[model samples]
Target: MDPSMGVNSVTISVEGMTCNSCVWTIEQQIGKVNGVHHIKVSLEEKNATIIYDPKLQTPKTLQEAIDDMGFDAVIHNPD
Candidate 1:
């Protein structure tokens, strides 16, 4: 499903993260993307819940931002 225009949250699975440092790296990188209001990375869950502005950024772009960090990110579409 497409995220609502202004503000939305998307949960995505991330791989190749090994520790808190990995989590910190993902958060810092993704946070750099414009419109990314906040990001919550759970090392145990191996996923990230990001709160962002869909009007300024799309899920795929956000996933790409994560991928650029040498990790894989896939949005889970609950449809």
Candidate 2:
């Protein structure tokens, strides 16, 4: 499903990932965000799917979380 079609789910591309451990690390870091309810990350695809509450968070917060973990994130599309 397109991300924006729903309430606050987004699929984004993450750069600089190198291994399965990186995926797990990033997932855990992003999961720490306040409004984030769940995260699914794929090392093979270098993607991050986040289900968050928009009223409680923003992509900036997500980006910051990724950055804090020494990774990069960009929205593939809001949809």
Candidate 3:
């Protein structure tokens, strides 16, 4: 983590998750990604709030990771 750049936060909208398992899977999968400091996948909120090192991760990379998990994810998409 870069102290100078600090941490970045993003709330990504997710779809196709049906239960707590979905949340756990997302958290666990993304948790392994480098620079992911923290992540919370909310089943009720249908989104995930993540704290990561910007130097290592981006909203695109994070979202793509989730997408690769066979789910739909959009970063801060206003609906």
Candidate 4:
């Protein structure tokens, strides 16, 4: 669960969240994904922060999980 211990962190922008239920939904779905160690969804920020095991999960997989829940998810990575 610790980033220092082989876990990677990513922040993703989420769309279509209109209430706390939306946030809870995202958390519940992605939180169940394999290798997902932690989850934080912010309604005000319209994003989710996830800490997961890179060996078992990919950002795209997380995005897909969100999509299946009827929300949009995009990994926020910048150079």
Candidate 5:
């Protein structure tokens, strides 16, 4: 996907994320990436739902960003 394009939804399973504040931090980091529109994170599920530009982010890139934030992330983009 191109960095300029947008996606309606994306979901990711993440590890090493704890606390509600941690969820906020994750969203804040993900928001730093270009093309990101909306973000939602759940600490209980350790998952993140995002509306972003597919052009600027791939599943792999998104995972890496979570990893960079000190967590392990597995992307789940349901069709």
Candidate 6:
């Protein structure tokens, strides 16, 4: 569903990815997360760029989701 309030995008780092499968795993799983519109996990960059609804998700929450998926996820926020 397109977010009624539009959407916010965040790019976060995910550690412990040994192969392309790891990237696929993260994307497939997190793409299923509630409020997430899209997720692209890149092995080369070691990061995931996620588009999600602000009302139901945030950059920190997105990172936590990846963390729960058995990876070390760090937000790209300078704050």
**Residue pairs in candidate 4 whose N, alpha carbon or C atoms collide under 3 angstroms:** none
Local distance difference test scores for all models: 0.76, 0.74, 0.77, 0.79, 0.72, 0.76
Tens-digit lDDT string for candidate 3 (1-79): 5543676777888887868888888898778766777787887788987877777667777777788776778877422
> Which candidate should be chosen as best, given TM-score against the real structure?
4
Model 2 alpha-carbon drift over 4 Å, by segment:
1-7
Task: Give the lowest summed-lDDT range of ten residues in model 1.
Answer: 1-10
lDDT at position 1, candidate 5: 61
Better candidate number, 5 or 6, judged by lDDT:
6
lDDT for predicted candidate 6 compared with the true structure: 0.76
lDDT of 6 by residue, 1-79 (tens): 5454587888877778868887877887778776777788887788888888777677766776788677777877534
Against the hidden reference, what TM-scores do the models get?
A: 0.79, 0.76, 0.80, 0.83, 0.73, 0.78
Candidate ranking under TM-score, highest first, comes to 4, 3, 1, 6, 2, 5
lDDT of 6 at 31: 85
Q: Worst 10-residue stretch by lDDT in candidate 6? A: 1-10
- Candidate 4 C-alpha lDDT tens digits along 1-79: 5454987877888877978888888888888876777888887788988877787777877778778878777778531
Candidate 5 residue-wise lDDT, 17-73, digit = tens: 677677878888877765567777777887987777666566555666677777767
> What are the C-alpha RMSDs, in order, of all predicted structures?
4.2, 3.8, 3.3, 2.1, 4.3, 2.7
> Candidate 6 clash total?
0
Candidate 6 at residue 2, lDDT? 48
Q: 2 or 6: which has the higher lDDT?
A: 6
